[PDB]
Amino acid sequence: VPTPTNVTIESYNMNPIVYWEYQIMPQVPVFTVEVKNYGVKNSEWIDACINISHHYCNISDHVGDPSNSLWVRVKARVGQKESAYAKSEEFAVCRDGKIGPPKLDIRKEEKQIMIDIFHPSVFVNGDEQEDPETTCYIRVYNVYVRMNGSEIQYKILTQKEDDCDEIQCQLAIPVSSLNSQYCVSAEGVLHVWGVTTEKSKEVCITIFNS
Template sequence: NAMWIDACNTSQHFCNIFSVINDPSLSLWARIKARLGQKESAYVESKEFILCKQGNIGPPAVGIRKRENQIIVDIFHPLVNTSEKKPVPIYDENYCHIFTYTVYLKINGSKIQYRVSGENEDNCNETQCHLVIPVSSLSSHYCISAEGFSEDWSVKTEMSDDLCITTSDDKHIEDSVWVPIVAILLFLVLILVFVYCYTKKMNPCKKESIMLPKSLLSVVKNASSEARSEPKCVSPIT
C-alpha cells in the first residue's frame, strides 16, 4: 500500500526527496503544505511522476588529455545527491540509468561523433567512461563535449561544456628549435668575416724588412762611407 513519507521541513523553495526514495522507477506523488506560526494550509498534491523518466539530469563532466599519438577523452557520469555526504555517480539501475554517451569531437572545426556504451566494461566503470582517439602527426585543435542517453527510459542528460586541447607535431617542434640556432651561427660567421675584412683594409700588408747580420751590416756601412768620400776626377781625352 502507498504511504506518505516526511521528506523535509524547510524554509527554502525546494526539497531534495531522492534520499527517501527506495525505487526511483516507481510512480510517485508529492504533497506540500505551508506553515506560518501556529497556522497551516491545506495540502497541495502533485501529479503522478516517475523520477527516472521525468527527473532532470545534469551533464556529464568531460576531460581530455594527450598520450603519445592518442587523445584520451574521459566522460564522468552525472552526479546525484543522496542521503550520503557526497554526490554519487548515476551508473546502475539503482539510480535509474546506465547511459550511452555521444561524444562530439571537433578537429580544426570539422565535427565527428562517437558513441560510448556504459554497459561496456572495457570502456566504463562505476565513475566514468573513456574514449581513445588516434591523432595525426600534424598540429591540430581538438574540442569535445558529451551528453548521455538512457535507452531504458528515453531520457537525455544535459550537454556538457566544450573542452579543448591543441596538439603539436613533436618532429616539427624539434626542427623548429634548430632554426634559431642555425640563424645565430650564420650571424656570428658573418660578423667574423666582416671584422677580418675590415682589419685587412685598415692595415694593408707591408713588405717585410730583411735583417742582415751585424758583421755584414758594418761592411756595408764602411763601403758606403768610402764611396761618398772618394773624389771624382774627370780627364778630357785628347
C-alpha cells in the same frame, strides 16, 4: 484555511524539492508536505516536512528507486485551521529530473588523443544512497568531437563495452585531418526513458606534428 497553489517538484543530480505558492495570510501559516510513492505496502502517505514555514521541501528521503513515480501533496494550517491538500502530478525522478554533466579529460599518446569521461558526480559514489538495483544509469555516452570545421559523435556503451568502469570511460581518437584544436564535449543517456545528462563544457586540445 486557503489551499496551496502551483505545486511543483524539481530535481537535479537526484534530489527533488517540492515547491508551492500561497497567498499572504494575516498570520504566518505553516505547511506539511506528504509523499506517496508507487508500490506502497498499503495506502499511507508520508510526512516529508511537518508544519514548515517556508515554500519548499527537500524530499530526498522519499526517493526510492529513482525510476518509481511518486506523488507529493501539501497543505497549510493557521488560526489552527488546516486546509485541503494540494496534489503534485506523478513525478518520476529519472524521467523528470536532470543530471549534472560528466567530467571530461583530453590528453595525448603518440598517434592518439585520449579522452576520459568521468561519470557524473551522482553515480560515482560506492553506493550508500543519499547504482545497484535501478535501471537509472547511463547507457550510452555521446562524445562529440569538433575539429577544423567538421563534427563527429561517438557512441559508447557503458555496459556492453570494457572502456567504462564504475569510475570512468575511455575513447581514443586518431590524430585526424592534419590540423588540430580538437574540442571534446559529452552527454550521458539514461536507461528506460533515455533522458540526457547535461552536456559538459568543451575541453579542447591542439596538435602540431609532421
